[PDB]
Design a protein around this ligand. Structure first.
Ligand SMILES: Nc1ncnc2c1ncn2[C@@H]1O[C@H](COP(=O)(O)OP(=O)(O)NP(=O)(O)O)[C@@H](O)[C@H]1O
Ligand SMILES: [Mg+2]
Lengths: 587, 572
């Protein structure tokens, strides 16, 4: 879709304003480098004429040598200078875009971040954003040097001969003509082969992730003839594309070769006298044919490098396709109020017609009506997809609701999220330890806490049970997504920090859901004794032991449908009893 | 550099297309150097001759040489690109057949240490990098060397001193510059690949743990620690570009130094000839054009450290000992497999709890035996019965013969298995079910697709529909009917079911257990599980605790007596 391609490259060229004095110096230095090329080719052409025509000894030519050596030094300086300026252009764009991405991703909060795998956000922040470096560092600076340097060459050859300058300039319209003429036969070979080369692209990794399936079926020897056949197909199918993409590259090497060969013949023949045009009747000199011959390869070098950096435009329009889509998502955030709750005691939460809605606008929990007084341990049960966790997120301020959810008599949306989250602590379904070391994770809530309270905090959560089992003790590294702590060990440390600070509410997504048998006993009784200190709301899948809790709040498809003490609805014959039967049907 | 030997031996298969593509990169690059050094000489010789020597000077031989050196420079580059990329896709096919054949015998256990999907994305990439050894290393380095030695030999016919100083400068920067810039950028290449992984792990730890960081008030403290890693990561990319800046600048000064030396030295004389007219421009224009051979050579040695690095990851993963070996007995497949186990390790001991008395269970020819373990359990029978690894204790017999007696040709033929993780291959439905029985006709595939209940997958040329990645996806309970379809197509006397109903809703799992009843009516079905929905039809139910069988017996027989299964049936 070239309608969006106009908007994508407009996005790419809009994000470049951050480093705009770097893309201006890189354009100025591409003009200077085109002037040091002409001076370099003018001093060699004049030195070579003196030695060859006038037979001037090299010791008399110390002034043109000094200038010639000087241009080579300045020519190398503005190549070193231009490489560095180009990096700064692309760095300050990647840095500023990545900050925007990590701000829209932090304001969106945990409700939206879970929409995608955690490695599918690190593709967007690491790979996609860094894929845009070479479009600003190398492609954009080169497209400036690809129009200035060739035009400086012609403007500097035209005073000497207009036929030498016409050879180089005559190929200026011919190259795009044939390159597009070929390039539109390479969009038919790249169209009928696009689907078949996307299927064959990932065929190896597909057969490589299903080796256990091929082992148990005895097809391991019959997939070598599939890799053999899907590689002959891939090769023969991509050589058709390449057979035309190397003609486009070869159009420029044809006119580079033709122009160097025409300058040589035109000048060589005009010195002899076979040709009598091109000059201004002043005669053609040897230094005017050397100048047009040193500058004939240099006329096409900017257009040749640009053909190598052109791929950087494709992988930067690819990364702009997903960065523009991400940055223009219309998702709406919960309102951060200014009201503050200074009760510092169990809150009297209660709600009416919440209609909790995801960031994308979809509704998650239907009409919700409940009144949980201060200090009352309350539980939620149900089946998957009923939005039991969507109510816990909505109480943490991660979700937006259309109705009244008044905490201690104050509307939640009007309550400032910063102050609301010191009276709140919770245990997640999946323990996430954002710190590095185990001691820091417990002290994540309180940056610096009294050691006796710390000691009492982690002893009470039964994390000291396996502290001797750890290599370095408390101050041990809990590596990211690594099994330094198993699911059992890493769940009691989540509870350890949940109970470290007093809270006016305590949510529990599903502590001890995927836990091991022994840890489940250890983690669950510590929370169970901790749900008697402040108003607690818990979501559980083990319906077997809930007699102590105050209510049940079983809900299905977004609405609380039964409420009451576990004794009441244990055998009432309702869906909770049916749901309880489902739990016992497995083991 | 010795890590590349196993793969450089893979190049011997295509040594004529690979060596042709290097010759075509020399002829192309000699014709570029010879087009600008014959033009430079032709202008000097024509100017010296002048109109006085219009007839004495032979202009049609150089004029026919600039036309020939311009056609081989143009067509040669086209054919060098075609040969070098064709010969690269043929090596890639070899590199994939090679790494697949070695990774198969060590499939389940040889890759168990690493995380499949994170290890297999590198394996695909490290094979895509050993493909680069020819285009990105061998061709630039070999092509540069024998272009230097062909212009040096050629220029030595005019002057030895001038050919050796021009060739000596080119050769001294072929053999010193690429290694000296790999050592300078070795410290920042280790730092760069370290800060990138440090930022990647801090970014995912900041994103996954966003729920906890906001509520525990540390999101903006772990954010400034994440920016400081980027600031350090961007400062290691600056130092790397400050070195490619110096590489390109220094490379320009050497090719500049080679021009002042050709101007200054060749004016004193080329050979005995003092004051040579046209032979000064032959040298200075050769030196002006010859340093095109050395343009890609500094980055070709940089990429050799990555082709070596990947040559080690691929070599260590594929140079591992397979867990099991299969004798080449060629035993014919026999029907009515009866499975007998003696003292076999059900689950590997937890931190070596004790000498686990192996489960000595006997299964008759047609018996459907269900193993009812606790959550976690961890039956390896599906792993030991398919010979994913040899059992350290006890012996396993298939039809009163040891399991190790069967070759893989027949072991995979007398056992049919449905796993928990069913794999949806990317191929078509026809190819994704012929995995089971290759010889089956298309009609038989369509029948079993209805006899299992996958009639929704037969719509609008369903058998030709692409599945898996880049195609329509099957959800839980759709795959489980596809895994069973394969097991029914690849009919084997003994059927192992890992957990045929896990995560299935009660409405659809009922169809799965009943499907077993009539489809696998005469089959030595052995189904381990954790659920109770339809164990009544399973003969000889086994209840399982930590590797020791508590009780066995038919559902009615086992329920009538008070037992472990009795508490499971009623309550917890
Ligand atoms: N952040 C979200 N964005 C969009 N849809 C969501 C989101 N969170 C939940 N849902 C949807 O809400 C329903 C599930 O709600 P959820 O709160 O996950 O229930 P649950 O009972 O906690 N699920 P589970 O933990 O698997 O037992 C499904 O329709 C989900 O796709
Ligand atoms: Mg949930």
């Amino acid at each position: 879709n070239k309608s969006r391609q106009k908007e994508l490259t407009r996005w790419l060229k809009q994000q470049s304003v951050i480093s705009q004095r770097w893309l201006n110096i890189s354009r100025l230095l591409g003009f200077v480098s085109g002037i040091l090329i002409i001076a370099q080719a003018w001093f060699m052409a004049r030195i070579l004429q003196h030695m060859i025509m006038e037979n001037i000894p090299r010791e008399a030519l110390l002034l043109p040598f000094t200038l010639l050596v000087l241009t080579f030094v300045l020519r190398a300086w503005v190549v070193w200078l231009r490489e560095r300026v180009g990096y700064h252009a692309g760095q300050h764009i990647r840095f500023a875009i990545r900050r925007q991405v990590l701000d829209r991703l932090q304001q969106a909060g945990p409700a939206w971040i879970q929409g995608k795998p955690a490695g599918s956000w690190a593709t967007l922040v690491l790979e996609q954003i860094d894929d845009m470096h070479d479009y600003y560092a190398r492609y954009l600076p080169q497209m400036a040097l690809a129009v200035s340097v060739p035009l400086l060459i012609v403007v500097a050859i035209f005073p000497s001969n207009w036929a030498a300058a016409l050879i180089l300039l005559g190929t200026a319209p011919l190259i795009p003509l044939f390159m597009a003429l070929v390039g539109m036969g390479a969009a038919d070979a790249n169209r009928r082969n696009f689907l078949a080369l996307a299927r064959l692209s990932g065929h190896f990794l597909d057969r490589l992730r299903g080796m256990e399936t091929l082992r148990i079926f005895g097809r391991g020897e019959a997939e070598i003839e599939s890799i053999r056949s899907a590689s002959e197909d891939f090769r023969q199918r991509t050589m058709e594309v390449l057979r035309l993409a190397f003609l486009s590259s070869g159009i420029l090497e044809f006119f580079t070769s033709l122009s160097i060969a025409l300058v040589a013949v035109y000048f060589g023949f005009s010195y002899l006298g076979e040709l009598d045009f091109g000059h201004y009747d002043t005669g053609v000199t040897l230094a005017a044919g050397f100048l047009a011959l040193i500058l004939a390869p240099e006329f096409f070098q900017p257009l040749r490098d640009l053909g190598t950096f052109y791929h950087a435009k494709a992988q930067a329009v690819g990364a702009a396709d997903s960065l523009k889509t991400f940055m223009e998502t219309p998702l709406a955030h919960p309102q951060r109020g200014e009201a503050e709750l200074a009760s510092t005691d169990p809150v009297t939460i209660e709600a009416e017609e919440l209609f909790i809605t995801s960031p994308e606008g979809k509704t998650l929990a239907g009409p919700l009506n409940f009144t949980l007084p201060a200090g009352q341990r309350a539980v939620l049960v149900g089946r998957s997809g009923s939005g039991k966790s969507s109510l816990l997120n909505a109480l943490s301020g991660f979700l937006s609701y259309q109705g009244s959810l008044r905490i201690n008599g104050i509307e939640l949306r009007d309550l400032s999220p910063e102050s609301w989250r010191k009276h709140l602590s919770w245990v997640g379904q999946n323990p996430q330890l954002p710190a590095a070391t185990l001691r820091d994770n417990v002290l994540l809530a309180r940056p610096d806490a009294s050691e006796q309270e710390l000691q009492a905090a982690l002893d009470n959560a039964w994390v000291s049970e396996f502290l001797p089992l750890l290599p370095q003790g408390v101050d041990t590294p809990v590596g990211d997504q690594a099994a330094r702590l198993s699911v059992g060990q890493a769940q009691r440390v989540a509870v350890a920090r949940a109970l470290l600070n007093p809270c006016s509410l305590l949510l529990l997504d599903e502590p001890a859901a995927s836990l091991d048998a022994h840890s489940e006993q250890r983690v669950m009784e510590a929370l169970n004794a901790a749900s008697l200190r402040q108003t607690t709301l818990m979501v559980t899948h083990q319906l077997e032991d809930l007699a102590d809790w105050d209510v049940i709040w079983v809900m299905q498809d977004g609405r609380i449908i039964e409420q009451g003490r576990y004794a009441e609805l244990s055998v009432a014959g309702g869906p909770f009893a049916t749901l309880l039967a489902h739990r016992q049907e497995e083991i | 550099m010795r890590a590349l030997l196993p793969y450089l031996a893979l190049y011997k298969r295509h040594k004529w297309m690979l060596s042709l593509g290097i010759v075509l990169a020399i002829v192309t690059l000699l014709a570029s150097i010879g087009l600008l050094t014959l033009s430079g000489w032709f202008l000097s010789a024509s100017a010296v001759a002048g109109v006085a020597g219009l007839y004495s000077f032979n202009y049609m031989l150089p004029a026919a040489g600039v036309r020939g050196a311009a056609i081989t420079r143009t067509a040669g580059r086209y054919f060098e690109r075609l040969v070098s990329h064709d010969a690269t896709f043929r090596v890639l096919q070899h590199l994939r057949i090679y790494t697949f054949s070695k990774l198969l015998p060590l499939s389940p256990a040889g890759l168990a240490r690493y995380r499949q999907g994170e290890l297999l994305n590198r394996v695909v990439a490290d094979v895509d990098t050993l493909d680069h050894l020819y285009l990105r290393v061998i061709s630039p380095l070999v092509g540069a060397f024998v272009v230097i030695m062909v212009v040096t030999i050629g220029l030595s016919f005019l002057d030895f001193t001038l050919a050796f100083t021009l060739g000596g400068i080119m050769l001294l920067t072929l053999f010193l510059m690429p290694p000296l810039f790999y050592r300078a950028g070795k410290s920042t290449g280790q730092n760069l690949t370290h800060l990138r992984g440090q930022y990647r792990q801090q970014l995912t730890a900041w994103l996954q743990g966003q729920a906890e960081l906001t509520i525990f008030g540390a999101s903006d403290r772990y954010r400034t620690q994440l920016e400081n890693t980027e600031i350090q990561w961007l400062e290691a990319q600056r130092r790397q570009s400050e070195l490619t800046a110096l590489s390109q600048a220094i490379m320009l000064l050497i090719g500049a130094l080679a021009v002042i030396l050709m101007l200054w030295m060749a004016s004193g004389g080329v050979g005995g000839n003092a004051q040579p007219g046209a032979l000064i421009a032959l040298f200075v224009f050769c030196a002006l054009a010859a340093f095109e051979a050395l343009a890609p050579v500094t980055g070709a040695f940089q990429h050799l450290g990555q082709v070596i690095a990947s040559a080690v990851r691929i070599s260590d993963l594929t140079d591992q000992k397979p867990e099991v070996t299969f004798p080449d007995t060629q035993t014919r497949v026999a029907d009515r497999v009866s499975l007998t186990l003696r003292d076999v390790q059900f689950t590997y001991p937890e931190q070596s709890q004790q000498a686990l008395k192996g489960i000595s269970l006997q299964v008759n020819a047609g018996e459907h035996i269900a193993i009812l373990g606790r959550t976690g359990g961890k039956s390896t029978l599906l792993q030991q019965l398919t010979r994913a690894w040899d059992p350290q204790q006890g012996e396993i017999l298939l039809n009163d013969s040891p399991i190790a007696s069967l070759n893989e040709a027949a072991l995979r033929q007398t056992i049919s298995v449905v796993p928990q993780r069913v794999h949806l291959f990317s191929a078509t439905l026809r190819d994704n079910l012929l995995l089971a029985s290759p010889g089956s006709s298309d009609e038989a595939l369509s029948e079993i697709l209805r006899r299992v209940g996958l009639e929704k997958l037969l719509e609008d040329a369903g058998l030709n529909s692409w599945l898996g990645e880049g195609g329509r996806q099957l959800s839980g309970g759709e795959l489980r009917r596809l895994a069973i379809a394969r097991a029914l197509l690849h009919d084997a006397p003994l059927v192992l079911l890992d957990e045929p109903t896990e995560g299935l809703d009660a409405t659809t799992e009922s169809q799965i257990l009943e499907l077993l009843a009539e489809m696998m009516r005469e089959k030595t079905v052995l189904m381990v599980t954790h659920r109770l929905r339809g164990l009544s039809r399973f003969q000889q139910i086994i209840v399982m605790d930590n590797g020791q069988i508590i009780e066995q017996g038919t559902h009615a027989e086992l329920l009538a007596r008070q037992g472990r299964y009795y508490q499971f049936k009623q309550g917890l």
